[PDB]
Design a protein around this ligand. Structure first.
Ligand SMILES: *[C@@H]1O[C@H](CO[C@@H]2O[C@@H](C)[C@@H](O)[C@@H](O)[C@@H]2O)[C@@H](O[C@@H]2O[C@H](CO)[C@@H](O[C@@H]3O[C@H](CO[C@H]4O[C@H](CO)[C@@H](O)[C@H](O)[C@@H]4O[C@@H]4O[C@H](CO)[C@@H](O)[C@H](O)[C@H]4NC(C)=O)[C@@H](O)[C@H](O[C@H]4O[C@H](CO)[C@@H](O)[C@H](O)[C@@H]4O[C@@H]4O[C@H](CO)[C@@H](O)[C@H](O)[C@H]4NC(C)=O)[C@@H]3O)[C@H](O)[C@H]2NC(C)=O)[C@H](O)[C@H]1NC(C)=O
Ligand SMILES: *[C@@H]1O[C@H](CO[C@@H]2O[C@@H](C)[C@@H](O)[C@@H](O)[C@@H]2O)[C@@H](O[C@@H]2O[C@H](CO)[C@@H](O[C@@H]3O[C@H](CO[C@H]4O[C@H](CO)[C@@H](O)[C@H](O)[C@@H]4O[C@@H]4O[C@H](CO)[C@@H](O)[C@H](O)[C@H]4NC(C)=O)[C@@H](O)[C@H](O[C@H]4O[C@H](CO)[C@@H](O)[C@H](O)[C@@H]4O[C@@H]4O[C@H](CO)[C@@H](O)[C@H](O)[C@H]4NC(C)=O)[C@@H]3O)[C@H](O)[C@H]2NC(C)=O)[C@H](O)[C@H]1NC(C)=O
Lengths: 207, 207
């Protein structure tokens, strides 16, 4: 029978009024026998009717994939409302229901700390600039780097890790040329999270 | 079902001759009728006979979970030999085979750097001591912390993250009392990896 995956908005999308947060309900393994798929959507159990279902697309394994997209109000997602996708197909014993929402719990403001390169690293070509983001809840967060207003490419961020107290931490590492650092350029760690003032903070770093 | 999952040894176990590395073959979704399951094990195609089947554990959905544990030679796992778990059950059309081995490729030695607390953090009760381990391959690694020979409790380690060059990094974070740090105790990050001399290195940290 067919399978359903329900996907949440991206963190940045819910934190910025300029962006468009969406919940996405994907049905795969729809057969040729029974290709009609119905979607019902509920917000905290109350049916809504504004979702955009794009038309089915047969995959290269001869099953159909159909997608339905519900736009969410920023504040609804953040006030913790619950999004239910109900999928009907005549090849199911019963309809499939998936639910999604923000992780439950009291939001906690991340602490952001920049850490310079270890002395040992300075006799390398590259140097790692570190951004420690700890104490946050839920785990949804965006981290970015920049210097003089231009975004930086060459950085990697760990997944959020669960701390003993139920909050999360992560580290972001920006790899720069030793020279750029040692001439004293300003590097900035950006953090976006619901529990920050204006959903944004920036922490700077130089020699 | 039934379905089979095949798990590698723990990093520490393969890196120390004193410990016992095992590969673990887990079967799930075996029913109450025929919970009979046979395991065959091969090391680079050659059958071995020293695996131990631990007793069934039914779970709250009334399917059985059945586990078989094969202890492996340290050097075999590290020389990249291939471990095949073959599962037989009357509810299979044909037997299930899973294979596992160490990630292929030249091992690379982790670079290990301890980073003191951010200035900002020093006006907290707790302080974060950081251990940056980068440049290592494969991703199998153990990190531990200590002071005066005694292990530390209160630390968390990120999973390995893939860098742009195909190697991995992680961070380990040790949370201590400000006092302990500011009295100038020595804190040590231990790292165990196959590409280190004696599979082990240690880096120290103090005020
Ligand atoms: C037939 O074909 C279709 C279509 O595939 C296409 O055509 C075929 C022929 C090939 O050529 C393919 O290469 C080609 O792509 C097959 O459809 C696939 O079906 C599988 C399941 O059989 C689905 O698996 C799920 O994948 C999601 C992740 O999917 C996202 O990321 C993928 C990239 O890695 C990407 O391909 C997907 O499109 C999708 O992308 C996301 O889309 C949203 C909305 O569009 C977007 O906003 C996101 O940004 C975007 N993300 C990215 C990364 O770009 C994965 O999460 C699922 O995992 C859950 O379920 C598994 C059980 O199946 C389980 O093992 C996992 O652990 C996991 O379990 C979940 O865990 C969470 C906790 O983490 C828990 O809370 C959840 O409750 C739990 N989930 C459930 C429901 O229990 C899952 O693996 C493929 O996505 C799907 N592909 C597409 C494109 O639809 C089909 O399988 C083929 N049929 C047969 C019979 O072979
Ligand atoms: C009935 O219940 C049982 C019991 O489950 C328990 O009870 C139920 C009711 C629920 O409450 C559960 O939440 C609860 O756990 C169900 O049994 C489960 O069955 C599923 C599916 O059959 C299994 O899924 C797989 O799990 C592995 C992860 O396994 C480790 O981590 C789990 C926690 O996340 C943990 O539960 C496991 O026990 C295990 O933990 C490790 O165990 C070994 C054992 O020796 C130990 O040495 C380790 O140290 C230990 N680690 C630690 C510290 O925890 C998951 O990885 C699998 O996903 C792979 O395959 C998917 C395809 O199915 C794919 O989507 C994933 O991405 C992933 O595959 C990756 O990519 C490809 C495939 O695309 C693959 O080839 C790659 O190898 C792989 N890459 C890498 C590197 O990851 C998979 O999801 C559950 O583990 C299992 N739970 C238990 C405890 O047995 C049962 O299904 C239920 N029956 C019914 C009614 O259906």
């Amino acid at each position: 029978g067919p399978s359903v995956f329900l996907f949440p908005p991206k963190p940045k999308d819910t934190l910025m009024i300029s962006r468009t947060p969406e919940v996405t309900c994907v049905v795969v393994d729809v057969s040729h026998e029974d290709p009609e798929v119905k979607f019902n959507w509920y917000v905290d159990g109350v049916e809504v009717h504004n979702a955009k279902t794009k038309p089915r697309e047969e995959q290269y394994n001869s099953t159909y994939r159909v997608v339905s997209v519900l736009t969410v109000l920023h504040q609804d997602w953040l006030n913790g409302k619950e999004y239910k996708c109900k999928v009907s197909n005549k090849a199911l014993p019963a309809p499939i229901e998936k639910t999604i929402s923000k992780a439950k719990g009291q939001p906690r403001e991340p602490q952001v700390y920049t850490l310079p390169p270890s002395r040992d690293e300075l006799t390398k070509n590259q140097v790692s600039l570190t951004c420690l983001v700890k104490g946050f809840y839920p785990s949804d967060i965006a981290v970015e780097w920049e210097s003089n207003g231009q975004p930086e490419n060459n950085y990697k961020t760990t997944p959020p890790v669960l701390d003993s107290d139920g909050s999360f931490f992560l580290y972001s590492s920006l790899y720069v040329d030793k020279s750029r650092w040692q001439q004293g350029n300003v590097f900035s760690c950006s953090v976006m999270h619901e529990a920050l003032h204006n959903h944004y903070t920036q922490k700077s770093l130089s020699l």
